[PDB]
Design a protein around this ligand. Structure first.
Ligand code: CLA
Ligand code: CLA
Ligand code: CLA
Ligand code: CLA
Ligand code: CLA
Ligand code: CLA
Ligand code: CLA
Ligand code: CLA
Ligand SMILES: CCCCCCCCCCCCCCCC(=O)OC[C@H](COP(=O)(O)OC[C@@H](O)CO)OC(=O)CCCCCCCCCCCCCCC
Ligand SMILES: CC1=C(C/C=C(\C)CCC[C@H](C)CCC[C@H](C)CCCC(C)C)C(=O)c2ccccc2C1=O
Ligand code: SF4
Ligand code: SF4
Ligand code: SF4
Lengths: 739, 41, 130, 61, 160, 171, 80
């Protein structure tokens, strides 16, 4: 009878497994039409409509988190197992600059063995662009046995998380008060999870990754490198590489932290041997992060007369312009899972995009900057994940507004005041979007039409009307001057992208000053415009989710509904879901432009080879500066030019990329059937098909119905995203692996 | 094992098992007799 | 603070009526409440009722009727909606005969009733050029 | 026709036209559509029952 | 011969294709070492390529001017193994599938809960019906004769 | 204190009294503009608006036109001046047609009172209704407004061309 | 304004009237059904065409039918 958990709440039985739709009150009666099947999967994780108790929803969410973490652990275990058994990691360790990472071999069936490429190191397989080899090398993993043991540990951890989810749904489910301890949860997630994870990783780096990687960079082969445990039992194997361990932990406890400058450095730049960040800098960074997060975890009052109450902090932040201020926000975020999901997903996607930027900007792994496929894939993948997560955060903000928003509890607070002037916000955001689009894109079109008319001096180019990004160049200058002036204890700039020397590893450029000209001005304003339009769609969905001048009772129709009818001139897509659908489209557009800008700019003005005398030759040859300013330039010198490797991949080991290119084109075009058409035509065609089936006595008892309007839109957008992202995926991968 | 066998009798599990078996015997026919453009007879 | 004492304690929203409800028509909903309950405006956000006479103006009949439907959740039933033309031309709209349209009242005649099902409608080709 | 009888729907604008249903009750009052028929197949709106006139239903032998 | 094509056994371009593929595979084989699994895999690829080309040559297959086997599907039994025999095989298999599906639909259509037995298959009855589809050509031309294959006027029709 | 309140004590208007809509700075600044400055005939309002608009309109045409010159060119100035004048002509055409299709009044601030007093049982929209009581809201008022806009636009464009020439020559 | 017609298949279940967002439909006495009531459309000038009325109709092919016609500021749902 614990005060935090309920014991044996749900019986572990297979009876409900044999009753599909048991969770829903409407679906429990059984299918009558094929719409029931689709409704079954669309409501599976909508725990809000399955129970009327916040406690039950919270418990379901907790167990679902455990299942998701078990799935993630299984995926990581699979990655490590493939590295251990079906990879050339050992060969890549001895030749990182000449062996391509491969960790998946393809069975010899139907002639598909051509996919096993010549990745080097007496190996055949698919080249890997996830950068696991570089990460494992940065971890100090020098043998495939360690990868096998990490895979075994991942399997054990996945089983543990599965057992935890089962235990906390069926044997000991926490109570609502336990879930609502946001102060305790924040304290623990900030100190324990974040800070202690940073501290543990700093310890691992210092004791395992720092010596092993230093020996690897010195040229010591992985076979004669001591086993990682020997660096702990023997204080002399690590004190030779870093002659500060001879003093032990006495400098730490005597506040003489200057003695540890051997392995806790602040250098900046990149390791000249590997092209990645100095691992001493990384260890010092993780140590500082650990201390900062542990300190930050002692902020909120949990169980003693010590710390802050988030309710008292929010309620004190009022103002003349904001009425009641943040009063009621604590109740909103402690009684609505959707609001927490909105905030967490938005910040999580933004964090993913920031991670993507800082990855290529400052390569943190050895021999990852010179693996161009890995860098391109990591950036594009993380930016895509960030965009999807941001759209999801907007969607769940809209869901909270529709479902969990209480008008009485939010009288004259920030949420109320935002809804009260939603018109002004949306109208000014509309004006900003029109201004930004007009300018950015019409400058592009003006360049295109001036070039087409033979007026080269009328373009918005560097040798013409020039739009120099002076503000960004000022920041670039400030960073390259930071070491010794504003960061006096730095030896080198944080990233060579801001300026400095060309860093090359094995005649391949790792990082180099990224010059910003009029071409970068236009593409940056294109990014701003696309982001603003996506924000416009999502914010219009969130703010007008409850009511509008069209439908004053839109909240009574729910978050997900197709329309209110053909009246009022037509009330299609007025939902808030139909705004997360359009916003998904615009996020695809924005992220596609972002990754295109990254790919072309890097290939044209960063990546390449360096001659022995210091001459820099890039992959494309600097065509970004003069040919990325017109739409015809993007079509020809980027799309047409770099699509050559994809279309000429047939018969080679990259033929799978051409096949996926074609299939993604097919899927993207397939989406337009659902996006352009309507439900009535398909229902009436199914009518004649059903007539034929009845004529042959083969009409199913479950009456076949065309997909609902909302499901038709969802299928269309899912296929559109899959096709477009897969086309860009195949194009990028084939292009950057070939060259 | 009365409701577990009923769960295995559901449409998704049965379709997954049948399609896995179908792809399996197709792939194995194509392994043991590969590159079959015409009827063997 | 407000023009009239019977107005709900609303802080004003940029979702109210526009120049249309000054030269074409405006709609007013009146009701009496026992408690100063906090309710959501059909246009903007949260407003506070008056413990007594309450009067609200809107640009559409649908907005007033949505507010009235919300009022039913507060056990408020005596709400009445009027249409005001550009001058003070008041016309009672929603409780037209004092009884809600969902309840049958004597004195109502059927309007738009056809004495046949859908299948009895005339063929469009016979309804050409009239 | 009576309760439990099987009838064929003769109404053309019906989701169950030419199909067979089960009569739930035949009203004896002066209503226009007294015959209430229950069907196994739900229509597009989800309902599985409807009131029919005496000349819009034909009893199955 | 038929349509101006020639047998692949006497098509020079066919042998050129075989030689070029084998040469590419051997050049790939040259860059690996000893009896290592990559060399074994490439050698198996070479052997399979040679076997496939030899089988296509000795298969009554007509090759065009590009040295690729062309299919003669006009209906002649001479090239009957290209389309006609696979056509019969597919017709048998697909008729089996359709027959067992229709039989299952009609069988569980006369139970108390026909819709339940469509998402939750009656595996015993399903297995009973599925292995009975080998007589689908005979069953179809024994149910059509009895009038049990086709509905007549209980089928629904739209308004016009 | 609260700096946002319902506009004119009406919580049902689609408007708010923010520190921008109803600030003393906003009041004075909009009351010194020609469109709202007291004591101006519609012709004077149009003339001032046209002068300012032609003055700032000649700029972009001369600077970024198809016949630019990094040095001073009489042809570039003439091209910019002609483009600005033709744009003012297009704007004046728009003003003329807008006034033609919008108003049917020759003397406002009275007809409203006449139909509020002596009844307006007519086809309405001319006797009754009548949006706005300004002198700019009449057929005569808008015609003189357009005339002033057009004349002032020409004069201001010429003045700005002269100023541009003087600045480019003597500086 | 749109056109709304009521047909004698009406069973007087009132679901159309209580679904109208603009108070167009009302229940009037009748003698053609058990409930003794039939829907009426006496205020079609307020009809917006949202067709919520016939989404709540349980009769087989509807007893209330909305025919979209000429548009008006009331029928277009214009708050401006
Ligand atoms: C969750 C991530 C993940 C993914 C995507 C894969 C994917 C793959 N694994 Mg794999 N694997 C994983 C986790 C994963 N594994 C884990 C956690 C382990 C440790 C137990 C393994 C152990 C493993 C072995 C030992 C082998 C594979 C093989 C394969 C490949 C063929 C799979 C196949 O045909 O099975 C078909 C499965 C079914 C029909 C069952 C239904 C495929 C690329 C095979 C391979 O690459 O062959 C060369 C192979 O031999 N995997
Ligand atoms: C063998 C162990 C076992 C058994 C018999 C049960 C039995 C039950 N669970 Mg349970 N559960 C288990 C393990 C088990 N659970 C574990 C390990 C977890 C943690 C993840 C949970 C979490 C959990 C929650 C949160 C809920 C249940 C519920 C239920 C009840 C209904 C389940 C149902 O119909 O959905 C059967 C569903 C499936 C078989 C789907 C499996 C989904 C997997 C995880 C997806 C993996 C696919 C993978 C990612 C690849 C995708 C491509 C039933 C009593 C529900 C309940 O009682 O509320 C009414 C409920 O809300 N369970
Ligand atoms: C220092 C203590 C501590 C630590 C380390 C964590 C760590 C975590 N919590 Mg958690 N939590 C804590 C205290 C702590 N919590 C307290 C005190 C409360 C009560 C307010 C909660 C309430 C809570 C909820 C409601 C949820 C979490 C979730 C999570 C996970 C977030 C997912 C993630 O980042 O993946 C990082 C993943 C890893 C690093 C994998 C290794 C982590 C393992 C499992 C260690 C977990 C520590 C655990 C608390 C020890 C208990 C053991 C048990 C025998 C008592 C993460 C594993 C979320 C989640 O995913 O649910 C499962 C979630 O929904 N926590
Ligand atoms: C932490 C992440 C997270 C979580 C927990 C949720 C959770 C939820 N979301 Mg949500 N969402 C997210 C991210 C997340 N979402 C993101 C990133 C987006 C933007 C795209 C959305 C957009 C979104 C919408 C628009 C809606 C939800 C809804 C829901 C609720 C019901 C979900 C459900 O039943 O789906 C069950 C799961 C499925 C139906 C799976 C569908 C399969 C997907 C679409 C295709 C995946 C393809 C995959 C990549 C493989 C393709 C490869 C190909 C070759 C085969 C639930 C509370 C719905 C709701 O009603 O909320 C109350 C709703 O309407 N969400
Ligand atoms: C190439 C196709 C295309 C184009 C041009 C646009 C353009 C636009 N969309 Mg988009 N959209 C598209 C495809 C496209 N969309 C698709 C496929 C979808 C489906 C998901 C959407 C969904 C969508 C939504 C949901 C929203 C937009 C919005 C916008 C507008 C953003 C504001 C802006 O930049 O206006 C400026 C106009 C342009 C940049 C277009 C070119 C104008 C030129 C360059 C300058 C002016 C030329 C000049 C006037 C020509 C005069 C001569 C002529 C008379 C002969 C803009 C009009 C948002 C909106 O309403 O605006 C805020 C919005 O909310 N779109
Ligand atoms: C479900 C369909 C199916 C069928 C009919 C067969 C049939 C066969 N398999 Mg098999 N197999 C299948 C699926 C299937 N397999 C799957 C999904 C896997 C995992 C990817 C394997 C892995 C496998 C191996 C590893 C071997 C067979 C072998 C065999 C043969 C002897 C047993 C036989 C022809 C054996 C054989 O003939 O090889 C000599 C053998 O060694 N199979
Ligand atoms: C829909 C049109 C179509 C048709 C007619 C074919 C026909 C063929 N394909 Mg093919 N294919 C198609 C679509 C099609 N494919 C698509 C869409 C793809 C992309 C995924 C492929 C990818 C593909 C590959 C990669 C390969 C083929 C191969 C083959 C040939 C060998 C078939 C086989 O395994 O027989 C043997 C198997 C059977 C006859 C199964 C039936 C046996 C049952 C159990 C008999 C039992 C009853 C007695 C055959 C000519 C193979 C080949 O050799 O090409 C010449 C080959 O390597 N195809
Ligand atoms: C298995 C039973 C079955 C049978 C006997 C038929 C028979 C027929 N269908 Mg059909 N159909 C079925 C299932 C079936 N269908 C399913 C499951 C779907 C949904 C995808 C469709 C969708 C469909 C369409 C859209 C059309 C037909 C059409 C037709 C007719 C012409 C043949 C054709 O085009 O094939 C069409 C076959 C397919 C599109 C693929 C069917 C998918 C699989 C192979 C069938 C399902 C197998 C099932 C799971 C087996 C379970 C039984 C087991 C438990 C015992 C013919 C009356 C056409 C027509 O009206 O022409 C007169 C037409 O336009 N059907
Ligand atoms: C940026 C302007 C800014 O954030 O100043 C801050 C300004 C000050 O508001 P308050 O003093 O009332 O805020 C006090 C508490 O609400 C703390 O949030 O907020 C606004 O007035 C919002 C108006 C946005 C107008 C967009 C331009
Ligand atoms: C085709 C179409 C239909 C009909 C589509 C239907 C009935 C979907 C049928 C799906 C089948 C029955 C199952 C899926 C079969 C696929 C082969 C499985 C997916 C492939 C896997 C690899 C995922 C609609 O209902 C619709 C509704 C609204 C707008 C547009 C449309 C629309 O375009
Ligand atoms: S069906 Fe399509 S069009 Fe007709 S109302 Fe619903 S959404 Fe608008
Ligand atoms: S459309 Fe249907 S619902 Fe909307 S008002 Fe007219 S009748 Fe009532
Ligand atoms: S909808 Fe049809 S049934 Fe429901 S009330 Fe109106 S008329 Fe009677």
């Amino acid at each position: 009878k614990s005060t935090i958990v309920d014991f044996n709440p749900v019986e572990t039985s297979f009876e409900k497994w044999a009753k599909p739709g048991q969770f829903s009150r409407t679906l429990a009666k059984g299918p009558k039409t094929t719409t029931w099947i689709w409704n079954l999967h669309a409501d599976a994780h909508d725990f809000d409509i399955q129970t009327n108790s916040l406690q039950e929803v919270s418990r379901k969410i907790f167990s679902a988190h455990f299942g998701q973490l078990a799935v993630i652990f299984l995926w990581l275990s699979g990655m490590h197992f493939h590295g251990a058994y079906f990879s050339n990691y050992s060969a890549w360790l001895t030749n990182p600059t000449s062996t391509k990472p491969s960790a998946q071999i393809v069975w010899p069936i139907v002639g598909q063995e051509v996919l096993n490429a010549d990745v080097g190191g007496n190996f055949q397989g698919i080249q890997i662009t996830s950068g696991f080899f570089q990460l494992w090398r940065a971890e100090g993993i020098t043998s495939e046995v360690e990868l096998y043991w990490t895979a075994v540990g991942g399997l054990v951890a996945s089983f543990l998380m599965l057992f935890a989810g089962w235990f906390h749904y069926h044997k000991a489910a926490p109570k609502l008060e336990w879930f609502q301890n946001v102060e305790s949860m924040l304290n623990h997630h900030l100190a324990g999870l974040l800070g202690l994870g940073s501290l543990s990783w700093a310890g691992h780096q210092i004791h395992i990754a720092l010596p092993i990687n230093k020996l690897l960079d010195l040229g010591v082969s992985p076979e004669e490198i001591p086993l990682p445990y020997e660096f702990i039992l023997n204080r002399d194997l690590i004190a030779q590489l870093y002659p500060s361990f001879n003093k032990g932990l006495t400098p730490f406890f005597t506040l003489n932290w200057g003695e540890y400058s051997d392995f806790l450095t602040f250098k900046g730049g990149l390791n000249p041997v590997t092209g990645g960040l100095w691992l001493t800098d990384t260890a010092h960074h993780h140590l500082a992060i650990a201390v900062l997060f542990i300190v930050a975890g002692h902020m909120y009052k949990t169980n003693w007369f010590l710390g802050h109450s988030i309710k008292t902090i929010l309620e004190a932040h009022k103002g003349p312009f904001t009425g009641e201020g943040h009063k009621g926000l604590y109740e909103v975020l402690t009684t609505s899972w959707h609001a927490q999901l909105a905030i967490n997903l938005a910040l999580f996607g933004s964090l993913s995009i920031i991670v993507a930027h800082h990855m290529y900007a400052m390569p943190p792994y050895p021999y990852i900057a010179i693996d161009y496929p890995t860098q391109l894939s990591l950036f594009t993948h993380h930016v895509w994940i960030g965009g999807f997560c941001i759209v999801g955060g907007a969607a769940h903000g809209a869901i909270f507004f529709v479902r969990d928003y209480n008008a009485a509890n939010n009288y004259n607070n920030l949420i109320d005041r935002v809804i009260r002037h939603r018109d002004a916000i949306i109208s000014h955001l509309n004006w900003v979007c029109i201004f930004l689009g007009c300018h950015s894109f019409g400058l592009y079109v003006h360049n295109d039409t001036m070039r087409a008319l033979g007026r080269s001096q009328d373009l918005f180019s560097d040798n013409a009307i020039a739009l120099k990004p002076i503000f960004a160049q000022f920041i670039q200058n400030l960073h390259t001057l930071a070491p010794g002036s504003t960061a006096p204890n730095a030896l080198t700039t944080v990233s060579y992208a801001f300026g400095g020397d060309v860093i090359s590893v094995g005649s391949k450029i790792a990082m180099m000053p990224i010059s910003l000209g009029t071409a970068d001005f236009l593409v940056h304003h294109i990014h701003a415009f696309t982001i603003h339009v996506t924000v416009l769609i999502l914010l219009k969905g969130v703010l007008y989710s409850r009511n509008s001048r069209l439908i004053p009772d839109k909240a009574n129709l729910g978050f997900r509904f197709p329309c209110d009818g053909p009246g009022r001139g037509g009330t299609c897509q007025v939902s808030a879901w139909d705004h997360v659908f359009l916003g998904l489209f615009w996020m695809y557009n924005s992220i596609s432009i972002v990754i295109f800008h990254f790919s072309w700019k890097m290939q044209s003005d960063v990546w390449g080879t360096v001659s022995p005398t210091g001459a820099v030759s890039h992959i494309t040859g600097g065509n970004f500066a003069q040919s990325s300013i017109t739409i015809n330039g993007w079509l020809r010198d980027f799309l047409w030019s770099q699509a050559a490797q994809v279309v000429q991949s047939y018969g080679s080991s990259l033929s799978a990329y051409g096949l996926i290119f074609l299939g993604a084109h097919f899927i993207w075009a397939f989406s337009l059937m659902f996006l352009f058409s309507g439900r009535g035509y398909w229902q009436e065609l199914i009518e004649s098909i059903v007539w034929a089936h009845n004529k042959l006595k083969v009409a199913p008892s479950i009456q076949p119905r065309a997909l609902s309007i909302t499901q038709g839109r969802a299928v269309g957008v899912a296929h559109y995203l899959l096709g477009g992202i897969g086309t860009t995926w195949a194009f990028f991968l084939a292009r950057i692996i070939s060259v | 094992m009365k409701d577990f066998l009923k769960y295995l009798s559901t449409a998704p599990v049965l379709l997954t098992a049948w399609l896995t078996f179908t792809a399996g015997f197709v792939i194995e026919i194509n392994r043991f007799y590969p590159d079959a453009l015409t009827f063997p007879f | 603070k407000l023009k009239q004492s019977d107005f709900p304690k609303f802080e004003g929203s940029t979702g109210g009526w526009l120049s249309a409800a000054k030269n074409e028509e405006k709609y007013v909903i009146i009701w009496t409440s026992k408690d100063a309950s906090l309710f959501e405006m059909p246009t903007g956000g949260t407003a506070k009722m008056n413990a007594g006479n309450n009067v609200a103006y809107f640009a559409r009949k649908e907005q007033c009727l949505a507010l009235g439907s919300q009022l039913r959740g507060f056990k408020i039933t005596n709400y009445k909606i009027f249409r005001i033309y550009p001058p003070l031309d008041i016309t009672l709209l929603h409780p037209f005969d004092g009884v809600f349209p969902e309840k049958v009242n004597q004195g109502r005649s059927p309007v738009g009733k056809r004495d046949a099902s859908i299948g009895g409608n005339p063929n469009p080709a016979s309804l050409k050029f009239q | 026709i009576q309760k439990g009888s099987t009838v064929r729907i003769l109404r053309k604008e019906s989701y169950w036209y030419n199909e067979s249903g089960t009569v739930v009750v035949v009203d004896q009052s002066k209503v226009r559509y007294p015959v209430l028929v229950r069907f196994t197949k739900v229509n597009y709106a989800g309902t599985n029952t409807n009131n029919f006139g005496l000349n819009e239903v034909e009893e199955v032998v | 011969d038929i349509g101006g094509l020639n047998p692949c056994k006497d098509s020079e371009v066919f042998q050129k294709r075989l030689a070029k593929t084998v040469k590419k595979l051997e050049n790939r084989l040259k860059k690996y070492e000893e009896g290592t699994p990559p060399q074994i895999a490439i050698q198996q690829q070479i052997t399979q390529t040679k076997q496939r080309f030899t089988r296509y040559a000795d298969s009554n297959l007509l090759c065009g001017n590009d040295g690729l086997p062309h299919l003669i599907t006009d209906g002649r039994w001479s090239h009957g193994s290209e389309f006609l025999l696979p056509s019969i095989l597919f017709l048998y298999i697909s008729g089996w599938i359709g027959w067992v599906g229709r039989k299952y639909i009609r069988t569980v259509g006369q139970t108390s809960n026909p819709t339940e037995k469509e998402i939750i298959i009656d595996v015993p009855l399903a297995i009973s019906i599925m292995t009975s589809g080998f007589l689908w050509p005979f069953a179809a031309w024994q149910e059509f004769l009895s009038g049990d294959l086709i509905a007549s006027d209980e089928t629904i029709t739209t308004s016009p | 204190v609260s700096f946002i309140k319902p506009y004119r004590q009406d919580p049902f208007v689609g408007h708010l009294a923010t520190p921008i809509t109803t600030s003393a700075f906003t009041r004075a600044y909009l009351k010194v503009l020609p469109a709202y400055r007291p004591g101006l005939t519609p012709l004077s309002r149009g003339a001032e608006i046209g002068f300012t608009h032609g003055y700032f309109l000649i700029g972009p045409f001369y600077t970024y036109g198809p016949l630019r010159s990094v040095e001073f060119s009489l042809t570039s100035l003439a091209a910019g001046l002609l483009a600005a004048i033709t744009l003012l002509l297009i704007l004046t055409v728009g003003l003329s047609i807008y006034g033609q299709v919008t108003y049917d009044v020759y003397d406002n601030a009275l007809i409203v009172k006449l139909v509020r007093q002596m009844v307006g049982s007519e086809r309405t929209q001319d006797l009754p209704q009548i949006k706005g009581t300004s002198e700019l809201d009449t057929v005569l008022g808008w015609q003189k407004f357009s005339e002033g806009f057009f004349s002032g636009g020409l004069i201001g464009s010429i003045v700005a061309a002269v100023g541009i020439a003087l600045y480019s020559t003597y500086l | 304004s749109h056109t709304v017609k009521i047909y004698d298949t009406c069973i007087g279940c009132t679901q159309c009237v209580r679904a109208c967002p603009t108070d167009v439909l009302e229940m009037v006495p009748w003698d053609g059904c058990k409930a003794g009531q039939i829907a009426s459309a006496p205020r079609t000038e307020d009809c917006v065409g949202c067709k919520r009325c016939e989404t709540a109709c349980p009769t087989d092919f509807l007893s209330v039918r909305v025919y979209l016609g000429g548009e008006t500021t009331r029928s277009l749902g214009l708050a401006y």
